[PDB]
Amino acid sequence: QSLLEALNVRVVGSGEKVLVLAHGVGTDQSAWQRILPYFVRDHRVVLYDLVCAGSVNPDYFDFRRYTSLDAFVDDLLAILDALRLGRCTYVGHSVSASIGILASIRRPDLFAKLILIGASPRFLNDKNYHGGFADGEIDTVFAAMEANYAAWVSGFAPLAVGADVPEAVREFSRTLFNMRPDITLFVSRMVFNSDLRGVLGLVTVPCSVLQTSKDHSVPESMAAYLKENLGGRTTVHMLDIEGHLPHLSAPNLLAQELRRALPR
């Protein structure tokens, strides 16, 4: 396969503006399906799957290569260079918000704006920083994942969706069960260990921070931290949608905020 084929790159929509939708761990590009109707008549929308998606051939997940977020940034930049659509708006959920931040420091030319959903530069607390997780706290999650993947997904998918939206629990269960458990564990440990705090000030592009409500992974205080520390023009939108996956659980409401955050 080419890189574009391996990571299931898709370009949809009729417009001149370019929008990139980049999913998080545990999902794949189909997490955007109910957002697409709101953008495809005036954007060319680029979708792709992260290499850890269960929709990507598990042969591609090379543990020697994918040891830091920078190897994920390599793949994003390689796709955007291959598609040659030029300057774009980039929407990143959870790990893809971090991937977008780092890509925008390497290649600010490529990004008109970043729209960050569920963004965190560091999950672990540090001396005078609140990520949400104390030393040792995550261990019970990675123990449960390794001990009984299916029991772990059955309890975690409702928690991540947050709101009582059976269809979202279905979709997120489907994309967690499609992942190979050793990949889910490895990538979840790598992302949980990430720390982007020291590069936020190097961002130069505008950012909209769409801050999830009652997200297990990101305290509501994070939005203020990103507004203070991101180096470009940053705006905060506190979502009135519950949970980690607002694009699955309340696509209409999330799409209306995304549209409000577009550059011009």
Q: What is the CA radius of gyration of the chain?
A: 17
Active site residue 43: no
DSSP 29: G
Terminal Cα-to-Cα distance of the chain (whole angstroms): 36
CB of 203 to Mg ion, least distance (A): 8
13 near Mg ion, judged by CB under 5 A: no
Q: What is the rounded distance in angstroms from the CA atom of residue 138 to the CA atom of residue 140?
A: 6
Using CB positions, name the residue nearest to Mg ion. 231
Q: Contact 211/222 with Cβ under 8 angstroms?
A: yes
CB of 72 to Mg ion, least distance (A): 25
The amino acid sitting at 129 is Y
Quick note: the x/- pattern for Mg ion over 206-235, rule CB under 5 A, is -------------------------x----
* Token code pair at residue 228: 């203070």
Residue closer to Mg ion by CB (options 46, 196) is: 196
Active site residue 55: no
Residue closer to Mg ion by CB (options 181, 231) is: 231
136 marked as part of a ligand binding site: no
Q: What is the rounded distance in angstroms from the CA atom of residue 114 to the CA atom of residue 156?
A: 28
CB of 232 to Mg ion, least distance (A): 5
H helices, E strands: number in the chain: 10, 7
Which of the residues 28, 244, 247, 249 is marked catalytic? 244
Residue closer to Mg ion by CB (options 13, 231) is: 231
Would you call 10 helix, strand, or coil by DSSP? Answer: strand
Q: What is the rounded distance in angstroms from the CA atom of residue 153 to the CA atom of residue 172?
A: 9
Which of the residues 215, 217, 247, 249 is marked catalytic? 215
Q: What is the rounded distance in angstroms from the CA atom of residue 50 to the CA atom of residue 60?
A: 11
| Site size with Mg ion, rule: CB under 5 A | 1
Which of the residues 43, 94, 104, 249 is marked catalytic? 94
Active site residue 216: no
CB of 114 to Mg ion, least distance (A): 13
Instruction: Mark the binding-site residues for Mg(2+), compressed into ranges.
Output: 231
The site for Mg ion (CB under 5 A) is made up of: 231
Residues recognised as catalytic:
94, 215, 244
Q: Point out the annotated binding site.
A: 231
